[PDB]
A paper describes a structure:
The recently identified bacterial Sir2 domain-containing protein, defense-associated sirtuin 2 (DSR2), recognizes the phage tail tube and depletes NAD+ to abort phage propagation, which is counteracted by the phage-encoded DSR anti-defense 1 (DSAD1), but their molecular mechanisms remain unclear. DSR2 contains an N-terminal Sir2 domain that serves as an NADase effector responsible for NAD+ hydrolysis, a C-terminal domain (CTD) that functions as a sensor for detecting invading phages (as discussed later), and a middle domain (MID) that connects the Sir2 effector and the CTD sensor. DSR2 forms a tetramer with its C-terminal sensor domains (CTDs) in two distinct conformations: CTDclosed or CTDopen. Monomeric, rather than oligomeric, tail tube proteins preferentially bind to CTDclosed and activate Sir2 for NAD+ hydrolysis.
To gain structural insights into how the monomeric rather than the oligomeric phage tail tube proteins activate the NADase activity of DSR2, we first purified the DSR2-tube complex by separate expression of DSR2 and tube proteins, followed by mixing their cell pellets for the subsequent ultrasonication, as coexpression of DSR2 and tail tube proteins are toxic to the bacterial cells. Each monomeric tail tube binds to the CTDclosed in protomers 1 and 3, with a buried interface of ~3000 Å2. We observed more pronounced conformational changes for CTDopen of protomer 2 that are needed for binding to the tail tube, in contrast to the CTDclosed in protomer 1, suggesting that the pocket in CTDclosed in protomers 1 and 3 is better configured for tail tube binding than in CTDopen in protomers 2 and 4. The β8 and β2 strands of the tail tube proteins, respectively, forms anti-parallel β-strand interactions with the β strands from the CTDclosed of protomer 1 and MID of protomer 2. In agreement with our in vivo observations, the DSR2–tubeΔLoop1 complex showed a significant drop in its NADase activity relative to the DSR2–tube complex, demonstrating the essential role of loop1 for DSR2 activation.
Numbering used by the authors:
A (entry chain D): 22 to 74, 79 to 298, 303 to 462, 468 to 494, 504 to 629, 645 to 670
B (entry chain F): 8 to 42, 48 to 77, 170 to 176, 191 to 211, 214 to 236
C (entry chain E): 336 to 367, 373 to 399, 406 to 463, 467 to 546, 551 to 562, 579 to 628, 644 to 897, 903 to 1005
Write the structure that this text describes.
């Protein structure tokens, strides 16, 4: 299990994570639970025709002869009375369900996989006959490429005899096409199949017909008691297959198959659903893309790690939803201790300083357990926030070095009020565009909204010509933003998860609710007169406000001017000043806080703070 | 960021270690009409404390299969009892917050003591 | 969004730009077409009207569910009933979960999931089934972590087999992808239920800080949505928080706008359930809630008596259900705290008081907190003689437990059994306790904890018991004299008692002299205030200047250096003291300076009263 099986296992688990995997269920799995296998039936047919009793051609021919000479009724009756025995499912069914397959292709004709699927609760669109493919009620398919008995027990519902296999292409064209396209567009894991099976042979012939590097090599699980020979392994490796053996993996007896199925399948499911080098490689892929964004909200770093570790706004992290290794705890010991971080690979260490450059710039420090005294040092490296109103004009006329600056100068125009030209090159970035494409897309939508509301304000001066107002409406009225995040590459909406809320009009839906609980909590502290010895609920409000403000300004989101954002900023300062006034008569003013009160507060509100 | 040490009154065994977050000393009077004679100085003094992070000792949880709380220069609180109120959230949950109040005995008539 | 359906039940179009179909419908609804559409029209009729949809904008919501009303007994016989249909199973398992019995609900919700083949009920069953699993784990986490600390013993309501069984199934099961993994027909027909798999209305609540009507009415809509639909997430913290923020803000805004609002029986449920003892106490402090009008008092009597019935049945027989305890006890304690402002019948008052005293667990409400709970009920309801008996034998039983030398009643609030006897004596002034006096007649030197306990309840005891108890008692320590003072034994300071106070002052002087500690025994204050009140006539405590505050403030106020004055000092005094402090006139300018600073800095409105009633 050194090299030639670990590659397969990480590939399969990666495909399962993406949702792109399909399990080609064989007949060994269905016969593992007791079920009358085919050769019993064919030898029964022989005993009917002859006195005493097997190659594959005979398997196909004896039922064919019985059908030919004895007719239809007898064959139908014997098949019905031999295949009507209902049986309970086996654990391999619930395992193969728990692996969460997108579609399931089975060459079995028993209603066994579907029963387990219903018991688990997942809903699959069963496909049995020809016509059922058109009336698919879901996007997840349970293909029975050899029919079933659901429509009835009559023989032609399934394929067993020789002529049925001859006329398979012309009798099941749609199902064959579905099988071929599902094999092409997914990854395929063969389970419970003998290496000399006829279906495997035809499928390998078809994949031989295709051109080179036009598919992923499917994975085939073998479980025969004999250890795999090298010769057949080479023969099937060059035949576009990658094969995993349970005989070489463990040792067991020849007459039991449940344990050997369970060993490989449990290894598959349990393995990542270790050492430092894997850890730093693990979080690099999850952290490398975000270098495009200058600032990251700490309350969103949980979503980066699928809510693994809870990030506190003060720079402290406590294990939230980790049941495996403490990978990021290990990373911090690489940060605090240079000795263990020194013993790392060059490429990993070259990765490591990048996050070392990252995690320092976003304020995260260490655990909450290991935390000490933390200073509330927040800097805003955004020119618009500092109000250097001459500078962006200087920053605008300069030629754009790259597309990143093209977005930056585009927002500077929006900061300068000339949103007409700002929109004009906003389409240019979309034309020139890929994370910024999403950022260019929505800001183009937000900037339209401000102008339209501004148009009603003035009319209810002619800043914009009607043709610019005509062109803005044709491209936009069709454009919808709810589907924008879903309408994105699978990698993008999986990699960039913390960017979902910029799409919807309610960009601060969560941030409002979490502040209200603190707000009522803070106003609770007003009357009861209770000191906050620990990190106060009021401080984290300031820390949250500094977190949200930095992201919006540094990353150039048009939400920096919307009334919902302005009201959100205004209501945060109102209570923080309110607490400080009561604390003084039982927080001190700074330049950074001077900007927000001057920028987002109305005149009447300032009187309200003075009055109270 | 005061550290809380909760122990049993009978022994010196640490029940748990926590991080103090809030403390209330909002003492006040009771209803005057319902409660010339010598002055008594009746009051409804109450003290409450709340911690946001807690951690129970391994030995305590192993052996458990009146109290005293001291939080840190450092201040004690004798005869303290917890308020075992629980509420569950739809979001999976993770900061176990523990609130406890100091009892007042009739014989000693004191609730809080602080040493320096 | 074609027709924005506002909360009041009227219709306002918002997005429909084509032909008006809703306009046509209500016109046919109001006026008096094929027969197969007729049954469709009539079927659509009652659904709209029952759901509060009536008509357009141009042209009281009730809940009937056994869980909402607190009917922990009516729904019990429903449990034993054979559930007729699949929907009958759905309400059954939800009902099973409220009275604890989370294991039973897990079984049923599993059965209906495999049973149902509309398919909508399979969704709510799946959501509820996940919620109880999430519920069980949090309870299991509490019991092993906090349940040992709170109750003092490990309960483990669920076997190791069950908890191992449940984790096997909910693993690799997410609530987010459940909605996506449904038949496409189901997704189109049921585009509403994704938000279940609370947060939405909380944001709208912040925007409104009419506003009151549009906030209050939608509150029942949510309650008629979660409770009426057998949705288990109605037992979670976030929904509790939404109710907690909604009602707390509304009364604050209503009182602010008043400076009107009244609440019905349905408004009792949310405040009693989702509000804690701190939320009610904080609500009291910010705004006075006694001005509120309390309609539907008939409904509140049946609720408070019924909830007082449950605790009597629970705690008096076979302990209690730990699973049901956590969910029900919190609702029970707040309701009794609430019941100050309501008027109750004598038979009902005896029911709630008996449960509050006898069958209420000590670990939740100690003798101090149970007393104020009892005292608050006395505000609206005057003391009946039957309740006097309830407090009577309650003290008698307390005297019985005062035999163990380790057992001493301890109260966080600072109130004990003495204040009970004063309260009965307050309303009667002639009550003679036969049972306690009889035990006092059989009182010997052996039960020392008995001697000083009946000392605190001396007026209640008979004259025969008074002589019996006084023979074995003498003024020994400082607490003894205040025990005699509290009952009323001492009305003047005898020369002997002049020696105990000064000797304690020597004791407090002796132990004070390199490391100092700060306590709250408030014994120095009593000595100092007596000199201000001239009850003492000895000028020997002037050498203890600097022992503590509130001592030199009333003995030598002319050099107290009022920089150390605590403004909360005027609160601890009474009407007689405030006049004396104002009439002394040697610090009135100083006190009026400290009285005026708090009225502007804080909105406590009580420093306003002290500023006004005597102008100190």
């Amino acid at each position: 299990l050194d090299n030639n099986v670990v590659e397969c296992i990480k590939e399969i688990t990666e495909s399962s994570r993406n949702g792109k995997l399909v399990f080609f269920v064989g007949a060994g799995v269905s016969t593992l639970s007791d079920y009358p296998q085919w050769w019993r039936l064919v030898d029964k047919y022989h005993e009917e025709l002859y006195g005493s009793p097997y190659s594959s051609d005979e398997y196909l021919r004896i039922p064919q002869i019985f059908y030919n000479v004895k007719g239809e009724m007898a064959f139908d009756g014997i098949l019905k009375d031999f295949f009507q025995v209902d049986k309970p499912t086996n654990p391999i069914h619930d395992k193969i369900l728990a692996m969460n397959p997108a579609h399931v292709i089975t060459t079995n004709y028993d209603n066994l996989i579907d029963t387990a699927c219903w018991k688990r609760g997942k809903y699959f669109s069963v496909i049995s006959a020809e016509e059922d493919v058109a009336n698919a009620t879901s996007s997840r398919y349970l293909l029975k490429v050899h029919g079933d008995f659901r429509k009835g027990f009559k023989g032609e519902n399934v394929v067993l005899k020789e002529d049925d296999y001859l006329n398979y292409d012309q009798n099941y064209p749609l199902i064959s096409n579905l099988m071929k396209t599902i094999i092409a567009t997914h990854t395929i894991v063969f389970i419970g199949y003998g290496l000399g099976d006829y279906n495997i042979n035809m499928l390998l012939n078809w994949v031989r017909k295709l051109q080179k590097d036009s598919f992923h090599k499917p994975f085939f699980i073998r479980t025969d008691p004999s250890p795999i020979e090298n010769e057949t392994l080479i023969y099937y490796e060059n035949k576009g297959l990658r094969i995993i053996d349970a005989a070489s993996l463990i040792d067991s007896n020849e007459y039991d198959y449940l344990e050997r199925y369970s060993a490989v399948m449990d290894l598959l499911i349990e393995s990542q659903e270790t050492k430092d080098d894997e850890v730093i490689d693990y979080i690099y892929g999850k952290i490398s893309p975000l270098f495009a964004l200058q600032y990251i909200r700490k309350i969103d770093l949980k979503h980066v790690f699928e809510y693994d570790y809870h990030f506190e706004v003060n720079g402290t992290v406590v294990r939230h939803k980790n049941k495996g290794f403490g990978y990021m705890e290990r990373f911090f010991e690489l940060k605090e201790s240079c000795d263990e971080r020194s013993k790392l690979s060059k490429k990993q260490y070259e990765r490591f300083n990048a996050l070392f450059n990252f995690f320092e710039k976003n304020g995260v420090i260490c655990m909450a357990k290991d935390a000490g005294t933390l200073n509330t040092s927040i800097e805003i490296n955004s020119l618009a926030y500092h109000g250097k109103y001459d500078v962006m004009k200087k920053f605008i006329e300069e030629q754009s070095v790259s597309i990143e600056d093209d977005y930056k100068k585009a927002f500077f125009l929006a900061c300068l009020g000339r949103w007409e030209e700002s929109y004009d090159l906003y389409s240019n970035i979309i034309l020139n565009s890929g994370c910024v494409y999403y950022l260019s897309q929505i800001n183009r939508y937000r900037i339209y909204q401000s102008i339209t509301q501004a148009v009603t304000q003035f009319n209810g001066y002619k800043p914009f010509t009607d043709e610019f107002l005509a062109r803005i409406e044709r491209e936009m009225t069709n454009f919808n933003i709810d589907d924008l995040f879903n309408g994105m590459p699978f990698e993008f909406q999986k990699k960039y998860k913390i960017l979902e809320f910029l799409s919807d009009n309610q960009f601060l839906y969560d941030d409002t609710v979490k502040l209200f609980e603190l707000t009522n909590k803070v106003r609770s502290e007003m009357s009861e007169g209770s000191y906050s010895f620990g990190m106060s609920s009021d401080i984290v409000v300031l820390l949250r406000l500094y977190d949200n403000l930095r992201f919006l300004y540094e990353n150039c989101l048009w939400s920096v001017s919307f009334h919902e954002f302005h009201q959100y900023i205004r209501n945060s300062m109102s209570l923080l000043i309110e607490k400080a006034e009561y604390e003084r008569t039982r927080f001190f003013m700074e330049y950074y806080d001077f900007v927000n009160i001057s920028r987002h507060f109305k005149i009447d509100d300032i009187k309200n703070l003075e009055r109270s | 960021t005061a550290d809380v040490y909760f122990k049993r009154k009978s022994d010196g065994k640490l029940v748990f270690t926590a991080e103090a977050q809030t403390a209330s000393f909002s003492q006040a009077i009771s209803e005057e009409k319902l409660r010339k004679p010598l002055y008594i100085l009746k009051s409804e003094k109450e003290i409450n404390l709340t911690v946001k992070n807690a951690f129970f000792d391994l030995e305590w949880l192993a052996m458990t299969q009146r109290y005293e709380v001291e939080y840190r220069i450092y201040i004690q609180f004798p005869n303290v009892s917890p308020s075992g109120e629980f509420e569950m959230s739809l979001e999976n949950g993770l900061a176990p917050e523990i609130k406890f109040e100091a009892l007042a005995d009739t014989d000693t008539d004191e609730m809080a003591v602080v040493i320096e | 969004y074609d027709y924005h359906f506002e909360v009041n039940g009227t219709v306002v179009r918002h997005k429909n730009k084509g032909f008006g179909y809703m306009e046509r419908f209500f016109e046919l609804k109001e006026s008096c077409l094929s027969k197969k559409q007729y049954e469709r029209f009539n079927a659509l009729f009652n659904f709209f009207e029952k759901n509060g949809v009536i008509c357009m904008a141009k042209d009281s919501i009730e809940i009937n569910s056994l869980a909402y009303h607190g009917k922990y007994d009516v729904m019990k016989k429903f449990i034993e009933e054979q559930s007729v249909s699949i929907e009958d199973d759905y309400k059954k398992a939800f009902f099973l979960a409220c009275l604890g019995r989370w294991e039973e609900s897990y079984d049923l919700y599993s059965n209906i999931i495999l049973n149902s083949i509309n398919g909508c009920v399979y969704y709510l069953s799946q959501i509820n089934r996940y919620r109880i699993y999430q519920s069980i784990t949090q309870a299991v986490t509490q019991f092993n972590g906090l349940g040992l600390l709170t109750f003092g013993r490990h309960y483990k309501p669920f076997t190791d087999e069950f908890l191992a069984r449940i984790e096997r199934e909910m693993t690799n099961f997410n609530i987010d992808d459940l909605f996506n993994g449904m038949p496409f027909e189901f997704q189109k027909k049921y585009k509403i239920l994704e938000f279940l798999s609370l947060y939405d209305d909380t944001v709208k609540l912040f925007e409104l800080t009419s506003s009151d009507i549009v906030v209050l009415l939608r509150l029942y809509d949510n309650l008629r949505f979660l409770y009426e639909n057998c949705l288990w997430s109605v037992s979670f913290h976030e929904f509790h928080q939404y109710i907690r923020n909604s009602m707390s803000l509304l009364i604050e805004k209503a009182e602010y706008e008043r400076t009107g609002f009244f609440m019905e029986y349905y408004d009792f449920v949310n405040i009693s359930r989702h509000f804690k003892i701190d939320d009610i106490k904080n609500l009291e402090r910010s705004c006075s809630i006694d001005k509120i009008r309390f309609g539907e008092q008939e409904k509140i009597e049946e609720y408070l008596v019924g909830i007082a019935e449950e605790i009597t049945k629970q705690f008096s027989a076979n302990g209690m259900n730990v699973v049901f305890y956590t969910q029900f006890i919190s609702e029970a304690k707040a309701a009794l705290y609430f019941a100050k402002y309501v008027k109750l019948s004598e038979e009902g008052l005896g029911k709630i008081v008996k449960a509050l005293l006898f069958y209420f667990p000590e670990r939740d409400l100690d003798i101090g907190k149970r007393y104020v709970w009892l005292e608050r009920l006395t505000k609206c309801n005057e003391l009946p003689k039957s309740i006097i008996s309830i407090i009577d034998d309650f003290l008698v039983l307390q005297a019985e437990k005062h035999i163990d030398q380790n057992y001493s009643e301890v109260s966080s609030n600072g109130l004990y059994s003495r204040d009970y006897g004063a309260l009965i004596k307050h309303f009667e002034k002639n009550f003679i306790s036969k049972r306690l006096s009889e035990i006092t007649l059989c009182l010997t030197q052996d039960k020392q904890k008995q001697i000083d306990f009946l000392f605190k309840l001396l007026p209640l005891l008979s004259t025969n018991a008074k002589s019996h108890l006084l023979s074995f008692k003498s003024v020994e320590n400082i607490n003894d004299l205040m025990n005699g003072i509290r009952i009323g034994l001492i009305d003047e300071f005898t020369p002997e008692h002049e020696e105990l106070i000064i000797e304690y002052l020597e004791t407090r002087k002796v132990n004070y002299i390199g490391i100092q500690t700060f306590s709250s025994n408030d014994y120095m204050s009593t000595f100092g205030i007596w000199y201000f009140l001239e009850e003492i006539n000895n000028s020997k405590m002037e050498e203890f200047i600097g022992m503590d505050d509130q001592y030199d403030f009333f003995v030598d106020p002319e050099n107290f250096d009022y920089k150390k004055f605590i403004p909360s000092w005027l609160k601890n005094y009474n009407d007689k003291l405030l006049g004396k402090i104002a009439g002394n006139k040697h610090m009135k300018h100083h006190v009026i300076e400290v009285l005026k600073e708090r009225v502007k800095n804080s909105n406590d409105k009580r420093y306003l009263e002290i500023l006004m009633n005597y102008f100190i």
